[PDB]
Task: structure prediction
Amino acid sequence: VKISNVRVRPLVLPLKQPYHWSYGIRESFAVNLIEIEADDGTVGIGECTVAPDQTGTAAILYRLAKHLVGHSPHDVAPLIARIFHQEYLGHGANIMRAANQIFSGIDMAMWDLQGKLAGLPVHQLLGGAHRKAVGYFYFLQGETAEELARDAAVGHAQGERVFYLKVGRGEKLDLEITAAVRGEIGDARLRLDANEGWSVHDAINMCRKLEKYDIEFIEQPTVSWSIPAMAHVREKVGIPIVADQAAFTLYDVYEICRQRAADMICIGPREIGGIQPMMKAAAVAEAAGLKICIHSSFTTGITTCAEHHIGLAIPNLDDGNQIMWQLVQEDIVSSPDLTPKNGWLDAFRKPGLGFQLAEDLVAEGEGRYAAS
Amino acid sequence: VKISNVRVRPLVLPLKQPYHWSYGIRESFAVNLIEIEADDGTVGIGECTVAPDQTGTAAILYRLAKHLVGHSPHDVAPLIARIFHQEYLGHGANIMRAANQIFSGIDMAMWDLQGKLAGLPVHQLLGGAHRKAVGYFYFLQGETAEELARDAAVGHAQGERVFYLKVGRGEKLDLEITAAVRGEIGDARLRLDANEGWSVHDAINMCRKLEKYDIEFIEQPTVSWSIPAMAHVREKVGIPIVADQAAFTLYDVYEICRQRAADMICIGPREIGGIQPMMKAAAVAEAAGLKICIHSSFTTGITTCAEHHIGLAIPNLDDGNQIMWQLVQEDIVSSPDLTPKNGWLDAFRKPGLGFQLAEDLVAEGEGRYAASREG
Amino acid sequence: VKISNVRVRPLVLPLKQPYHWSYGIRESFAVNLIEIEADDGTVGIGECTVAPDQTGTAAILYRLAKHLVGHSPHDVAPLIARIFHQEYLGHGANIMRAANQIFSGIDMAMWDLQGKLAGLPVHQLLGGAHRKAVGYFYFLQGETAEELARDAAVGHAQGERVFYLKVGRGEKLDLEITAAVRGEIGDARLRLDANEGWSVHDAINMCRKLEKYDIEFIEQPTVSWSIPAMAHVREKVGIPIVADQAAFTLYDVYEICRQRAADMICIGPREIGGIQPMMKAAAVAEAAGLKICIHSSFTTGITTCAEHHIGLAIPNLDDGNQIMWQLVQEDIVSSPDLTPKNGWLDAFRKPGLGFQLAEDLVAEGEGRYAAS
Amino acid sequence: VKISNVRVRPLVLPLKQPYHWSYGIRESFAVNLIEIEADDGTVGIGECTVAPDQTGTAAILYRLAKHLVGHSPHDVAPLIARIFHQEYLGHGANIMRAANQIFSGIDMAMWDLQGKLAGLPVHQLLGGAHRKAVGYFYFLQGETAEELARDAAVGHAQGERVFYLKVGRGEKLDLEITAAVRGEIGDARLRLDANEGWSVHDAINMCRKLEKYDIEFIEQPTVSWSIPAMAHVREKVGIPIVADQAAFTLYDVYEICRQRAADMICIGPREIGGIQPMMKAAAVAEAAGLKICIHSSFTTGITTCAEHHIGLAIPNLDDGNQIMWQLVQEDIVSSPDLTPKNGWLDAFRKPGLGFQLAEDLVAEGEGRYAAS
Result:
């Protein structure tokens, strides 16, 4: 079997509700699908994030994927390495993180394809599942303490086990929203995401003031480019510190480990470059006595399935992994049901990444892209 | 004064001779020019490298540059910081190196604009020139020992001072071309570029075998992603080791310094994100007792001028800086003359980056780009 | 355009109230102004501190400045480097901190001149402002708890945001003044300056006893000559530690960073040698994941303006920077108004450093010097 | 007995021949004598270097010295500490090196006075002499290989044991002169002063190329401000590396020791602040298993005597210490004879620093100062 075709389909998908970010409001997510068809008709599907420009990154994704035509889906590793050396390194552009953003979709598509051709779910191509179900967090939403508390109340009543709250919104508001959320979730586990928002001394003082709320850990308190700075804060504060944006590549993971810069590493396919690279990141972390928590992205149910299979295949995995498809108004995955039950998703067993796409919703997504 | 327009012009320019690399030969270089126009008619010019796709990166360069319209050329630093946070970080794309590739041309053009508005060369906007001339290396060309030695012979007779030779072509050939070049340049300085080609133990053995040829230093012997691996090699071998591809961002530079991973750092605008960022990298190196050698790229005379002014402004600078405009068949810079004499280029003094573009050659470059898009 | 003349004007300026220091009370500040005139008539102005002897340092400043005559104001960096090498290093006087003290004023005047010639404020010659306003602290004054509590009440009344209190006056008094000040500022931020006054074990114990008062950070608890001693205390105490006197040169900054000896670095032009060197120090701090807080000096509004533009041009800056012109009875800067509003000074935009001097007040200052 | 008066005498003394430096030729140099007189008529005499301005530094020396009036010559240590805190630290001028430059002459005079009062040589006030004589180097002079070769031949003929040659004049010339010198001194010891002139990689390559000439050590190859850079070079080269300009204060010495940055430390009274400070620096080196080599300065026989007693009193001392009085046309010390014999100067036994000044030469020196 040989890869016969590759297609890139840019999509724009509306969110259920406005997503507040650094620069205004966000009402839709955008992804670039990558479809890899084998000569026997079987198709592997994956997707990439699109920053800084969907049209530009789509062109890049297409250019890299065309190199796969005529080759074997079972040679994904050496193929990506060659394409990387040829289109990036040979030109002096040693931008591994940026390359990873693109190869992530390519890699998940190839394994989806391999799984479909073998009639096996991806995790059974990676050594087997280390758990019967992957555990996920509860991504709280809201701009005010009242809204966040209401959301936490409902989630708690629904059986959610790991609450995820973003902070770094200023000292006063941070303590108010953290107090409000804790007030509605009893003794349940609460994790805070500082999103690189604190300087070293502010991180230390905020951790001190947040301890009283029983925080499981604080994710990426400091500017991600400095692993030493993160280590500096970790060694001083009493609340565990988890690396997120500080960890993109296999090498970043290694640096974090040897410098004992974090208590756990949160990384996903988008940062490391796919499914297989995640297993390698997981191995390094395991060797250093640390666990992996899956970091997600503003994508669709496709990434959800990939991250799910990645999770099942990793022995040293957290039980409060990230998940984001629920933010989409109409997700493009028609099956399986990606809705966690009590913060768990029992192992998916269909071939490849195990999903079916809602072609009608995908078409609408392409239409919105063309519209813009 | 405020920025009124921005323009991106993708170009394809032929090379004097084919450039050999890991994947066949290369017949031309591609760059994306970025023009930034102020409401008074003044125009700043810069350029960006294009990998992995010129059309895609040109689209990204344009999108970022449009954010500048309506703002001051004198606010380049905070403007870039904001654009980076908005189009990249806010979306979870913490790809500093990739972002730097694009911002390099923007920053390049911004300082050119500032210099033209003030009527001063860029280096005098950065504190003044620390030298009367920037020193450059001699990039040897050839695939065989014979061609390389002959080129070395000529360069030496012409007064070239710092020879640059690419190695990592296998032990036998590496030692053969090195010996051959050494044999034609008397006792002149010789630098070798391993181009990330050696594993740790091979790097150690190659250095041992190359020592007899009096090597000033070997550049990036190991895979660029691992700084510890480079430090590992440096501490073991007798020939000094220079960081190249391992050093892209301000943080990479700091890591190399704190780990004493290299004896000198070779970095340029394309990697760090511009002229101003280079000043920052230079300061970190200076604080660590290290010097900066400007790393160039497959670009044009526009970058040569930017790198030239960057060089004059850096106090802790090498005198064997990289230069590449000479590889282009017909470079797009009509003035000044970028040809070094005895490996030197006396300080350029015209406003901004100091160049004049050959409009017709740029147009032809635009024409080639259009052609490459017929497919 | 070239520099045609240079002149040094030693001044002695009375203070609003007595200043208490380790050896009594200071009734006035003294500065040595440095004016650099271009052949077109434009004049750049800066100032230097004068210890250990105003006459002696006035003599040095003039000798160094005279080397500028005949050269371009745009070649400030290589000029200072050459002067430093010829007048200091060539004689075996590797006294970088001492030379920085003098070059601070020179560099200050050179950029003022450059800005005036270009019609642009100094921060726009340095890349642009990274904020609309620079944030400043409230320099508390008083020798007893009652006095400090009163001054604190005044500051809180006018909306100050960051209170600065000097400690190291003995355990009993330190706790009593910190308690009284905290009692007048509600939940406002409080910073303590130990002024190199504690031994390693006393610093550890005092930090422990001061924690209850919610301290943002303690500045330079240990003797400034030992970077290791400072890191030693930082790693042990719960309150963040800020380096001040330990950081004078670019290399000192790198050492503190390299050794993670401080949580933030407080440094000013007087210590590092000017405006441009501060940019370099800030870059080193930035690469290490640390921020800069501007350390001021017993000087005039001239330095305030210089420190203001430096602050605007630094991306990684604190918002409780030091300011000292308000201590002078009649500051020599006639414009602009250097009085912060709620701890802020909106960006100055006039050419160069942006100030105009009250020649009458300067002439008076020269008179007091001549009198002494 | 208390100090009754202090006087500062600026001198300018011609050299035997032009001294070549970075900025041309130096045909003479200056010193600021400091005489401390006790109420019983006894007078202690010391001297200070004058960079960056003799008049300015003379004024500084006078201001600091007046503080000694009315106090005991036996309280030199606590007196200098107070003056330092009062005139420097209390004003935020933590310029220890600059202060040491001045205090060096003061301490020098105080121990000379203490010696004369007790009728004992200074080394016998410091614990006793650890050797019968102090070993000194042969300061080679010349600008070309031929001149250096002839001077070396002269030195060898008269029994010199330790040759000191300045390099860093470019690879070709450095190699030429070193070969030239080696060919005239047989197997004698040869030391090379790189004088902060090499970058890290140049230092490494030059040491390799100079190795064939049998070099005892290379002094300060890299910029003095970076101790890490010096350790970096030391760890790579085969020739021992000696710290010089990198070591000025007690703290610099400790840092060099702590970091194993040098194989020996070359430091003198001008850098550390006097005679007694040298004893402390020597103790730190000793505790670290390192030896001290006396670094001299462009001074007169007075400093030679001060450094001589310092040498006798240090147990962990080198035998190729620096000496510079021989460069002066008419040294101001009329006795003892400071001319080394086979590179040795037997222990001086006269009271204090044990010298007598040629009144007439000093007066003429005061004349030249006035004339300049």
